[PDB]
Design a protein around this motif. Structure first.
Motif, mmCIF file in Angstrom:
data_model
loop_
_atom_site.group_PDB
_atom_site.id
_atom_site.type_symbol
_atom_site.label_atom_id
_atom_site.label_comp_id
_atom_site.label_asym_id
_atom_site.label_seq_id
_atom_site.Cartn_x
_atom_site.Cartn_y
_atom_site.Cartn_z
ATOM 1 N N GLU A 290 -1.042 4.664 -0.973
ATOM 2 C CA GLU A 290 -1.488 3.631 -1.166
ATOM 3 C C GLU A 290 -2.461 2.826 -0.730
ATOM 4 O O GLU A 290 -3.609 2.862 -1.965
ATOM 5 N N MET A 291 -2.539 2.045 0.254
ATOM 6 C CA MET A 291 -4.137 0.650 0.846
ATOM 7 C C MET A 291 -5.613 1.876 0.534
ATOM 8 O O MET A 291 -5.935 1.440 0.337
ATOM 9 N N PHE B 245 -5.948 3.320 -2.671
ATOM 10 C CA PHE B 245 -6.495 2.022 -3.432
ATOM 11 C C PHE B 245 -8.009 1.421 -3.346
ATOM 12 O O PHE B 245 -8.911 1.132 -4.251
ATOM 13 N N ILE C 8 -3.017 7.655 -7.406
ATOM 14 C CA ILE C 8 -2.915 7.087 -6.028
ATOM 15 C C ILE C 8 -1.696 8.589 -5.278
ATOM 16 O O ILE C 8 -0.689 8.169 -5.862
ATOM 17 N N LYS D 99 -4.996 2.298 -11.154
ATOM 18 C CA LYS D 99 -3.624 1.841 -10.995
ATOM 19 C C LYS D 99 -2.556 2.440 -11.553
ATOM 20 O O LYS D 99 -1.363 2.210 -12.417
ATOM 21 N N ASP E 227 -2.063 -6.880 -6.734
ATOM 22 C CA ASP E 227 -2.786 -5.198 -6.300
ATOM 23 C C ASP E 227 -2.046 -4.342 -4.829
ATOM 24 O O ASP E 227 -0.907 -3.554 -5.734
ATOM 25 N N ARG F 31 -0.474 6.209 -10.972
ATOM 26 C CA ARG F 31 0.644 8.037 -9.953
ATOM 27 C C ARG F 31 -0.787 8.717 -9.994
ATOM 28 O O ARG F 31 -0.919 9.362 -8.677
ATOM 29 N N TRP G 27 -0.735 -5.263 2.460
ATOM 30 C CA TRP G 27 -0.376 -3.561 2.654
ATOM 31 C C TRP G 27 1.174 -3.320 3.005
ATOM 32 O O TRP G 27 2.058 -3.109 2.252
ATOM 33 N N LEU H 161 4.945 1.518 -8.340
ATOM 34 C CA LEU H 161 4.190 2.361 -9.738
ATOM 35 C C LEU H 161 5.643 3.211 -9.470
ATOM 36 O O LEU H 161 5.593 3.565 -11.167
ATOM 37 N N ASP H 162 6.504 3.468 -9.091
ATOM 38 C CA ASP H 162 7.567 4.464 -9.610
ATOM 39 C C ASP H 162 8.661 3.463 -9.808
ATOM 40 O O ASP H 162 9.410 4.288 -10.233
ATOM 41 N N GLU I 47 1.892 -3.970 -7.148
ATOM 42 C CA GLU I 47 1.993 -2.839 -7.755
ATOM 43 C C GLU I 47 1.640 -2.201 -8.038
ATOM 44 O O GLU I 47 2.355 -0.581 -8.200
ATOM 45 N N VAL I 48 0.684 -1.581 -6.821
ATOM 46 C CA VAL I 48 0.050 -0.467 -6.656
ATOM 47 C C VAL I 48 1.558 0.585 -5.200
ATOM 48 O O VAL I 48 1.903 1.298 -5.632
ATOM 49 N N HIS I 49 1.862 -0.509 -4.623
ATOM 50 C CA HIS I 49 3.446 0.601 -4.018
ATOM 51 C C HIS I 49 4.463 0.446 -4.894
ATOM 52 O O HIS I 49 5.499 1.628 -4.559
ATOM 53 N N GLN J 226 -5.989 -7.762 5.761
ATOM 54 C CA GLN J 226 -6.289 -6.650 4.567
ATOM 55 C C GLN J 226 -4.797 -5.760 4.506
ATOM 56 O O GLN J 226 -3.168 -5.682 4.397
ATOM 57 N N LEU J 227 -4.191 -5.396 5.447
ATOM 58 C CA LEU J 227 -3.372 -4.718 6.202
ATOM 59 C C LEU J 227 -2.385 -5.115 5.935
ATOM 60 O O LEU J 227 -0.973 -4.597 5.644
#
Ligand SMILES: Cc1ccccc1CC(N)=O
Lengths: 237, 300
Positions: free
Chosen positions: B177-178, B181, B172, B167, A110, B169, A79, A117-118, A113-115, A75-76
Motif C-alpha cells: 500500500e504505502m 502509493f 496498489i 487509488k 489517503d 486495486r 501508513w 480499497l477492499d 483510503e488506500v488500505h 510518514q510511516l
C-alpha cells in the motif's frame, strides 16, 4: 463529506462508525547526544479508535520495535495506523464492521483510503471538529498499559465506563470531550478536580471515578471553569 | 504530397490543419488543402464563425485512402468522407489545383514541430481510442467524454483512453500500500508498460494524442489523461533512462506549441509543480523545466 457542528447528531445514530486518531502513534523524546547533536528516542504509542455511540475503544499499542531501522517515521506512522485500522475492520464480523471511519487528521485520509480499497462501501471522512483525543495518554490506566507493553498488543476499553446506563451517547460523548479538553489544556488542574475527594474511587474495571449524577454536574462545571480560566490565562482576554 | 479536397465552403469557418489555421468566408471558392506531408497522422479541424460550441475535427493518414470534406446542411457540419474511386478523386484534385483553389500545407523546411508532436502517434492506435470501424479517419470534438469521465453516458461517442487511477486495486498491490502509493514504479512498469501498452512507444502515442485533442478541441477529458500519464512517470522512482530523455523532448515541444493565452485552462498547476519540483524525476526534465520556467513562470 466532512464531519462538522452542522451534522453532529449523526455520531449517535444506528450506523456503526469509528473515529481514528493517530496523534499518539509515533511518540519521541528529543535529547542531546555526547557530541552535542540532537537525537530522538521513540516511546510506545497507540492508535485511538473509538465508537462514539457505544464507547468501545480499540486501543492498538504501537511498540517502539515497529520503528527499528525504518526511515521517514512521521510518514510511516500514518501508513502503519491505516494498516492496523484495516486489519481491525477485517477481524470484525461483517455486521460489526463500521459504515464510516472519521479521521481526526486530514493526513490520514489517503493512507486509510488506500488500505481500505477492499471496502468500497466504507466511507472515509475528515472532520472540521477539533477533538481532544490526543489527551487519551492523560488517562492513567491507558498511559500505564501503553508504557508497560513489551510487544504489539490490542487492549479493549469502554471509555464511557457504565455512563450509558444513566445518560445518552450524545451526553456521554459531550462529557468525554469536556474531560479530554480539560486534561489537554491543564492536565495537573484537571487531574486535581477528578481525584481531590478521597471518598470517590475508580472501580478496577473503569477509567473514571464513580460520580453520582449531582457529582458529575459539579465536576463538569469545574472542567468548563478550568477551560475558560486557562483560555483567559493564555490569551490576555 | 497528399491533398484533402473540399466540395465547397457554404458556411464561414476557421479551418485548422495540424498546428496551422486559416479563415474561410461563407461561399468563398475554397476547394481544400494540398502538399500535406506523407509519413505522419494529420488533423483537420473546424470552428464555425457563428458558433462558440461546434469545435470538431478528423484525424487521418493519407496513406490509408483518399479523403475529402463536404458540408452537410442537415447535421450542420463539415464531414470527412472516403472516395473509393481513385481516378475520380485524382481528376477532382487535378481540376482544383489547375484552378489554384487549394491552400498549401505551409511547412517551413527547417521545422520539425509536427513530427515532434506526433512522433509516437499511429492511426491504428487512434482508431482504438475513438472506435468507428466503418471509417479510416477518426472524429473528435470539444464535448466528447472519456470512459473514465463516464464511470464517475453514450459509449459509442467516447474517448477510450487507458484508465489511470492512483487509488485503485490496479495501482496498489495488497501488502505494498504505502510503497505502491508513494512510488508508482510497479503501476508504470508492470501494469501499464509490460501489461497494457506493451512498450513506451504506445504509452507516448496515447500521451501525445491526449495532448493534441486537449489543445486543438479544448477537450477536458483529454487534458486530464495527458496530465495523468505525465504524473504516472514523474511519480515513479524507477523509469528506463531512454523513456525519461524522450519524455523531456515530448513535453518540451508540447509546451513550446501551446498558445500562451490557454496555459491557464490547459495546464494543471499541481501536476507541473509536483513533476518539476517535488517528484522523483524533478531533475530529469531539463528541457521541459527550462521552457516552462521561461514561458509560464506564474503557473509555477
Ligand atoms: C472494544 C470493546 C469495548 C467494549 C466492549 C467490547 C469491546 C470489543 C468489541 N466491540 O469488539
Amino acid at each position: 463529506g466532512a464531519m462538522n457542528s452542522s451534522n453532529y447528531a449523526e455520531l449517535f445514530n444506528n450506523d456503526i462508525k469509528l473515529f481514528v486518531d493517530d496523534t499518539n502513534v509515533y511518540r519521541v523524546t528529543v535529547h542531546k547526544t555526547f557530541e552535542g547533536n540532537v537525537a530522538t528516542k521513540a516511546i510506545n504509542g497507540c492508535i485511538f479508535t473509538l465508537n462514539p455511540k457505544t464507547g468501545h475503544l480499540f486501543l492498538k499499542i504501537i511498540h517502539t520495535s515497529v520503528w527499528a531501522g525504518q526511515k521517514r517515521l512521521s510518514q510511516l506512522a500514518k501508513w502503519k495506523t491505516a494498516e492496523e485500522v484495516s486489519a481491525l475492520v477485517r477481524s470484525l464480523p461483517k455486521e460489526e464492521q463500521p459504515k464510516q471511519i472519521i479521521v481526526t487528521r486530514k493526513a490520514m485520509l489517503d493512507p486509510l483510503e488506500v488500505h481500505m480499497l477492499d471496502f468500497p462501501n466504507i466511507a472515509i471522512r475528515p472532520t472540521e471538529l477539533r477533538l481532544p483525543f490526543s489527551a487519551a495518554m492523560s488517562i492513567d490506566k491507558l498511559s500505564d498499559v501503553v508504557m508497560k507493553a513489551t510487544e504489539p498488543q490490542m487492549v479493549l476499553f469502554n471509555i464511557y465506563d457504565d455512563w450509558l446506563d444513566r445518560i445518552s451517547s450524545y451526553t456521554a460523548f459531550s462529557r468525554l470531550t469536556l474531560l479530554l479538553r480539560a486534561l489537554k489544556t491543564n492536565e495537573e488542574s484537571a487531574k486535581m478536580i477528578l481525584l481531590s475527594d478521597p471518598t470517590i474511587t475508580i472501580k478496577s474495571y473503569h477509567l473514571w471515578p464513580s460520580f453520582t449524577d449531582e457529582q458529575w454536574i459539579t465536576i463538569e462545571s469545574q472542567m468548563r471553569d478550568l477551560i475558560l480560566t486557562e483560555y483567559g490565562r493564555k490569551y490576555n482576554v | 504530397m497528399n491533398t484533402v479536397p473540399f466540395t465547397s465552403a457554404p458556411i464561414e469557418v476557421t479551418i485548422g490543419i495540424d498546428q496551422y489555421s486559416f479563415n474561410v468566408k461563407e461561399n468563398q471558392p475554397f476547394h481544400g488543402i494540398k502538399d500535406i506531408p506523407i509519413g505522419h497522422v494529420h488533423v483537420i479541424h473546424f470552428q464555425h464563425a457563428d458558433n462558440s460550441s461546434m469545435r470538431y475535427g478528423y484525424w487521418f493518414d493519407c496513406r490509408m485512402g483518399n479523403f475529402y470534406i463536404q458540408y452537410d446542411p442537415k447535421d450542420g457540419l463539415y464531414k470527412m468522407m472516403e472516395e473509393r474511386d481513385g481516378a475520380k478523386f485524382e481528376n477532382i484534385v487535378h481540376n482544383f489545383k489547375e484552378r489554384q483553389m487549394m491552400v498549401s500545407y505551409p511547412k517551413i523546411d527547417e521545422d520539425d514541430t509536427w513530427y515532434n508532436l506526433t512522433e509516437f502517434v499511429q492511426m491504428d492506435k487512434i482508431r482504438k481510442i475513438v472506435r468507428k470501424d466503418e471509417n479510416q479517419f477518426s472524429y473528435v470534438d470539444s464535448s466528447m467524454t472519456t470512459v473514465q469521465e463516464n464511470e464517475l453516458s453514450d459509449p459509442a461517442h467516447s474517448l477510450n483512453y487507458t484508465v489511470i487511477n492512483f487509488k485503485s486495486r490496479e495501482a496498489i498491490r495488497p501488502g505494498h500500500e504505502m510503497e505502491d502509493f508513494l512510488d508508482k514504479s510497479y503501476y508504470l512498469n508492470t501494469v501499464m508498460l509490460q501489461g497494457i501498452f506493451k512498450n513506451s512507444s504506445n504509452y507516448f502515442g496515447e500521451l501525445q494524442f491526449a495532448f493534441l485533442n486537449a489543445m486543438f478541441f479544448g477537450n477536458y477529458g483529454s487534458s486530464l489523461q495527458w496530465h495523468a500519464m505525465i504524473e504516472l512517470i514523474c511519480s515513479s522512482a524507477t523509469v528506463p533512462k531512454h523513456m525519461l530523455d524522450k519524455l523531456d523532448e515530448i513535453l518540451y515541444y508540447q509546451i513550446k506549441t501551446l498558445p500562451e493565452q490557454y496555459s491557464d485552462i490547459l495546464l494543471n498547476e499541481r501536476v507541473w509543480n509536483i513533476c518539476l519540483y517535488s517528484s522523483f524525476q524533478k531533475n530529469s526534465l531539463h528541457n521541459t523545466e527550462k521552457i516552462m520556467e521561461n514561458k509560464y513562470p506564474e503557473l509555477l
